[PDB]
């Protein structure tokens, strides 16, 4: 009615084409991985590392299961190299690439029968390459049930993962180096030199490298582990700005003595193409809160309790009876924030009485109008909305911070720019980037467009003196690949979307600082 | 009175020009020699002529020098001495002589006859100091803006002072004639510092022009050539390269009209407003007078475009005409009555609108006044911004705001400003917008005891019109020159009372029409 009806192109725009994945490999001092039939060395330490890496789930105490586990992709020749007693690999979805062998054909080559019924759901053959597997793994019954997809081998498989379109989906490369006294390899693994067309535009950098370890294989073979990740220039934008703000920002102390380092005016860009979701990796982002709050904004809500009831307490300090009163909002029921954010978005200028009254047709519905223009006249330059209403400011628990957004369209993609007057680089900005990335994504799905990019304009960009110590540490971390957002379900109206309708996959942020 | 914004006692001390900008003319041989300490070792009539025309002529055409409008030349006392009394002072120019031994009267007494010193009294002034003191004198009201361009004309000591801070930062151009002198044996030299060296002080001298090798009719067939160097203007380059990127990578788009553009989404540029600098682009003259009249017009919260048209500023005629207004369904508006646009929102945000001449005193939110007050008591407040983008009022506006948001920031007594423009015509709009908001920051600063800092410009739909691509590509050939400056010849009791004539842009030398 006064809600926004999603078109019939809802799911296509954000349908995941290929699932992201990681790569594991052991290599000798020459890049050798095998002679074509087997691995010419025996370092049990690497075997354990491989077992644990591809088996373990990130969550604490979560044991693999059809509901939640990792998958492993391997060339058919690699499947045959594994002794039948060790097949299929336990706790992981075994995926085999074969133009001939079928799923059951693999189940038959196993010793037991009272076992093949257990592995029925643990093995799958794909008549195609890694790409074909990545597409199969991206479908609904594998995503997000499968937490991480690991390419575990086959010279040809590694080779395919290192060329487009697969390399663009490689989140990390775990490479073990074995200083073997022997050199009997004919199948290798090499990462294209930077700048080369073979590199694709990716620059692999070391996140970690172990000390030189000595194997207990009887030969004291020397080896070491190493982790490579694709340079995330977008997150680097953010780290660079924080660092600049800390090293050259103006120093100020407010009426309480609260210190800040700041600059005025900055801009960042983030891609939202192909399901990409710019959730910073150097410090985990409270995605569940971001999502619940945005949906909350879009519905034009003003009652913070709906948030705190879901475990999202970001608005508690500003919706308390105490804070409301310090604002002169003595008559607002507690947690009633007044005509903030979402209300102005959907009912700009309308008079406010109390949260959750019906406001149909009151004020200007900026979001609805932009939905219409985006669909009929995409070149329009008036497609923006604001929560900055000087007339209503006094009635707000707080004045809007991210206060303006403008949309733009080119090549069938929706782009958005956010204007933020005050930016806490440490605790706010990452949250804000997430919030508006999602907004652009949702608006794109509601207008038959595809997610383009988020442009973030910052006014007062700052770092609180306190946060300086923590931030300097976070700045040492090399950013990781960004995660992806998928929709497990769609809705008839934009206002009916729920946090559970969507899921962030392949998000592997660094631990707390 | 209370509806207006009263200027403080510091209104003039803050935008007060400390030093006047200048240019430098010099003739050096191939080893950087300029003289033996007493005179110039060579005789090249053509250079003497170049010097004469360059320092005497005023910009434009058929404008002869006059006491109320001419250039000035600054020279050391030894250079003044080297000129034969029969040529002193240099006609058509204010001759400024640096000296700690001779007064202005002593300079006059040193002239040949009385008929010469009597007439030539308003053409000579001696300053008891160096080039810097001279530039400060020149910055005073009786010399600025009356003096169009200041030229440093010599004395090794003077050239040296012009090439080191604080003076080099005010050096807008270097006109250097190189004499290919057969034999050279000077004792006084000159030489510009290379890019990247400390002595250059971050300045990257660019060669705007260089003549072909010329032969002097001095009798010795002496070879010589001319050069004009300019301090690289990175700021204007932000704009040129953005235009160039739009043309090469921009997406094609069309207006409701059907007119095509090339555009990119989201960009940002910065401009310093320190020491009276005003970012008026040089690769294409900007209509300053219209910029100023309109900006003041916004500040008063005006909505009647005829106030501008009656001042030879017709930038609003096309959108305030009976025809355009009817096309917008605003038939109850008298012609040129734009509706609650721009300034109306700035000073009376949210106020109901009827007609441009109704009394709106105290109606709606006066965002400008509120910001001026926070700026003077709580400078680090992070909510200092105003907006003309009022969803409620849009339908009643001739057209929705382009530059729709502005936020201020303070640091070290300096005022910075951030403009947010949703749509940006790079060719004809953007240069104008940068100028107006640079002006705004300066006026707000003057109104709050602050000094102009920086202007940050955020661009939304940044585009170049199809019918401008070619002419723009051309403009892109030009190497931008140094920006001009802004000075106020007088002040006002209230912000709303300032007039375009209260201020003047000086040392603005844009390239001629493409
Ligand atoms: N050092 C290490 O960490 C590792 C080393 N290895 C070593 O690597 C060597 C194996 O490498 P390699 O010969 O490349 O073999 P792979 O293990 O990659 O197997 C290749 C086979 O996978 C299938 N396949 C690959 N691409 C496709 C496709 N696009 N469509 C259909 N089927 C496809 C084919 O099966 P089919 O023939 O049925 O059509 C194919 O012949 C061995 O020596 C093994 O020991 C293996 C893993 C790890
Ligand atoms: N090639 C060219 O284009 C030019 C060459 N020349 C050559 O340059 C040589 C002259 O150079 P140079 O000896 O450096 O002389 P200058 O022409 O620079 O004169 C220096 C004199 O100017 C005055 N002065 C300079 N700075 C100050 C100050 N800070 N405070 C007070 N007075 C100051 C002093 O006057 P006082 O002593 O009275 O106190 C001083 O001795 C000559 O040979 C002349 O021919 C000159 C102009 C141009
Ligand atoms: C593990 C190993 C080399 N080590 C690392 N670091 N990465 C891999 N991808 N590997 O290869 C896994 C495929 C080959 O697996 C086997 C080959 C022979 C016996 C057994 Cl039990 C297994 Cl699992
Ligand atoms: C002129 C000259 C070198 N030429 C150029 N291009 N630049 C200068 N700065 N000059 O020096 C001017 C100071 C000395 O001027 C004279 C010296 C002797 C006689 C006469 Cl009539 C004059 Cl104006
Ligand atoms: O979405 C938001 C909301 C707030 N902040 C930060 C900026 C400031 O550090 C503080 C709000 O204080 P003021 O700017 O209003 O003073 O919260 C953000 O970064 N993002
Ligand atoms: O201050 C201004 C006013 C207008 N424009 C330009 C931008 C657009 O090219 C056109 C206005 O059209 P819309 O964006 O409203 O469609 O005028 C500017 O660049 N600056």
UniProtKB/Swiss-Prot annotation, chain A:
Q: Does the keyword Protein biosynthesis apply?
A: no
Q: Which GO terms describe its cellular component?
A: cytosol; mitochondrion
Which residues are catalytic? 401
| Gene3D superfamilies, sorted | Dihydrofolate Reductase, subunit A (3.40.430.10), Thymidylate synthase/dCMP hydroxymethylase domain (3.30.572.10)
User: Which amino acids does the record list as binding NADP(+)?
Assistant: 26, 32-38, 76-78, 97-100, 153-160
Annotated region (Thymidylate synthase) at 235-513
The UniProt entry, under InterPro entries, shows: DHFR-like_dom_sf, DHFR-TS, DHFR_CS, DHFR_dom, Thymidate_synth/dCMP_Mease, Thymidate_synth/dCMP_Mease_dom, Thymidate_synth/dCMP_Mease_sf, Thymidylate_synthase
What does the record list as coiled-coil region(s)?
Answer: none
Question: Molecular function terms in GO for this entry?
Answer: dihydrofolate reductase activity; thymidylate synthase activity
Q: Which reaction does it catalyse?
A: (6S)-5,6,7,8-tetrahydrofolate + NADP(+) = 7,8-dihydrofolate + NADPH + H(+); dUMP + (6R)-5,10-methylene-5,6,7,8-tetrahydrofolate = 7,8-dihydrofolate + dTMP
User: Residues that bind substrate, according to the entry?
Assistant: 24, 46, 152, 158, 176
Which biological process terms from the Gene Ontology are attached to this UniProt entry? dTMP biosynthetic process; methylation; one-carbon metabolic process; tetrahydrofolate biosynthetic process
Task: Give every DHFR domain span.
Answer: 20-230
Keyword Magnesium applies? no
Give the keywords, sorted: Methyltransferase, Multifunctional enzyme, NADP, Nucleotide biosynthesis, One-carbon metabolism, Oxidoreductase, Transferase
Pathway field of the UniProt record reads:
Cofactor biosynthesis; tetrahydrofolate biosynthesis; 5,6,7,8-tetrahydrofolate from 7,8-dihydrofolate: step 1/1
Q: Where does dUMP bind?
A: 255, 402, 420-424, 432, 462-464
Give the family this protein belongs to, as stated in its UniProt record.
Answer: In the N-terminal section; belongs to the dihydrofolate reductase family.
Q: How does it assemble?
A: Homodimer.
Function recorded in the entry: Bifunctional enzyme. Involved in de novo dTMP biosynthesis. Key enzyme in folate metabolism. Catalyzes an essential reaction for de novo glycine and purine synthesis, DNA precursor synthesis, and for the conversion of dUMP to dTMP.
Entry protein name: Bifunctional dihydrofolate reductase-thymidylate synthase
The species this protein belongs to is Trypanosoma cruzi
UniProtKB/Swiss-Prot annotation, chain B:
Lineage top rank: taxon: Eukaryota
Binding-site list for NADP(+): 27, 33-39, 77-79, 98-101, 154-161
EC assignment: the record states: 1.5.1.3, 2.1.1.45
Q: Name one GO biological process term.
A: dTMP biosynthetic process
The answer to whether keyword Methyltransferase applies is yes
Q: In which pathway does it act?
A: Cofactor biosynthesis; tetrahydrofolate biosynthesis; 5,6,7,8-tetrahydrofolate from 7,8-dihydrofolate: step 1/1
Coiled-coil parts of chain: none
Mind listing the UniProt keywords for this protein, alphabetically?
Methyltransferase, Multifunctional enzyme, NADP, Nucleotide biosynthesis, One-carbon metabolism, Oxidoreductase, Transferase
Q: Which residues form the active site?
A: 402
* Residues reported to bind dUMP: 256, 403, 421-425, 433, 463-465
InterPro entries listed in its UniProt record: DHFR-like_dom_sf, DHFR-TS, DHFR_CS, DHFR_dom, Thymidate_synth/dCMP_Mease, Thymidate_synth/dCMP_Mease_dom, Thymidate_synth/dCMP_Mease_sf, Thymidylate_synthase
The chain positions of domain DHFR read 21-231
Report whether Transferase shows up as a keyword of the record.
yes
Q: Per the record, which residues fall in region Thymidylate synthase? A: 236-514
PANTHER family to which the protein is assigned, alphabetical: THYMIDYLATE SYNTHASE (PTHR11548:SF2), THYMIDYLATE SYNTHASE 1 (PTHR11548)
Job description of the protein? Bifunctional enzyme. Involved in de novo dTMP biosynthesis. Key enzyme in folate metabolism. Catalyzes an essential reaction for de novo glycine and purine synthesis, DNA precursor synthesis, and for the conversion of dUMP to dTMP.
| Record text on subunit structure and interactions | Homodimer.
Q: What is this protein called?
A: Bifunctional dihydrofolate reductase-thymidylate synthase
Which species does this protein come from? Answer: Trypanosoma cruzi
């Amino acid at each position: 009615l006064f809600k926004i009806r999603m078109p019939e192109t809802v799911a296509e725009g954000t349908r995941l084409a290929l699932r992201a994945f990681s790569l594991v490999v052991a290599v000798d001092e020459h890049g050798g991985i095998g002679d074509g039939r087997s691995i010419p060395w025996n370092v049990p330490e690497d075997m354990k590392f491989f077992r644990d890496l591809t088996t373990k789930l990130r969550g604490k105490n979560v044991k693999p299961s059809p509901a939640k586990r990792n998958a492993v992709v391997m060339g058919r020749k690699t499947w045959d190299s594994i002794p039948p007693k060790f097949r299929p690999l336990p706790g992981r979805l075994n995926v085999v690439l074969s133009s001939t062998l079928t799923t059951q054909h693999l189940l038959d080559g196993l010793p037991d029968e009272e076992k093949r019924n257990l592995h029925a759901d643990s093995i799958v053959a794909v008549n195609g390459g890694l790409e074909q597997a990545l597409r199969l793994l991206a479908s609904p019954n594998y995503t997000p049930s499968i937490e991480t997809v690991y390419c575990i081998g086959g010279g040809s498989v590694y080779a395919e993962a290192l060329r487009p379109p697969c390399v663009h989906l490689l989140q990390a490369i775990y490479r073990t180096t074995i200083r073997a006294s022997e050199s009997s390899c004919s199948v290798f693994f090499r990462v294209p030199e930077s700048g080369t067309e073979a590199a694709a535009g990716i620059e692999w950098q070391r996140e970690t490298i172990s000390e030189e370890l000595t194997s207990a294989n009887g030969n004291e073979t020397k080896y070491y582990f190493e982790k490579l990740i694709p340079r995330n220039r977008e997150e680097e934008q953010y780290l660079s700005l924080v660092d600049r703000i800390i090293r050259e920002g103006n120093v100020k102390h407010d009426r309480t003595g609260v210190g800040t380092l700041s600059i005025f005016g900055a801009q960042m860009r983030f891609s939202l193409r192909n399901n990409r979701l710019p959730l910073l990796t150097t410090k985990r982002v409270f995605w569940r809160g971001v999502c619940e709050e945005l949906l909350w904004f879009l519905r034009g809500e003003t009652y913070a309790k709906k948030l705190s009831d879901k475990g999202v307490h970001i608005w508690d300090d500003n919706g308390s009876r105490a804070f409301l009163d310090s604002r002169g909002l003595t008559e607002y029921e507690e947690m009633d924030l007044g005509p903030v954010y979402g209300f102005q978005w959907r009912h700009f200028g309308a008079a406010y009485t109390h949260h959750d009254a019906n406001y149909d047709g009151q004020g200007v519905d900026q979001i609805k109008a932009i939905v219409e223009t985006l669909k009929t006249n995409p070149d329009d330059r008036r497609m923006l909305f604001t929560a900055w209403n000087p007339s209503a400011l006094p009635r707000m628990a707080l004045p809007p911070c991210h206060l303006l957004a403008q949309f733009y369209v080119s090549n069938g993609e929706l782009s958005c720019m956010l204007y933020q007057r005050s930016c806490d680089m440490g605790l706010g900005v990452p949250f804000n980037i997430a919030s508006y990335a999602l907004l652009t994504i949702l608006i794109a799905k509601a207008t038959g467009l595809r997610p383009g990019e988020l442009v973030h304009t910052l006014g007062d960009a700052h770092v609180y003196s306190n946060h300086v110590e923590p931030c300097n540490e976070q700045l040492k971390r090399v950013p990781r690949a960004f995660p992806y957002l998928v929709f497990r379900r769609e809705r008839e109206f934009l206002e009916d979307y729920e946090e559970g309708d969507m899921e962030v996959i392949d998000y592997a942020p660094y631990p707390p600082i």
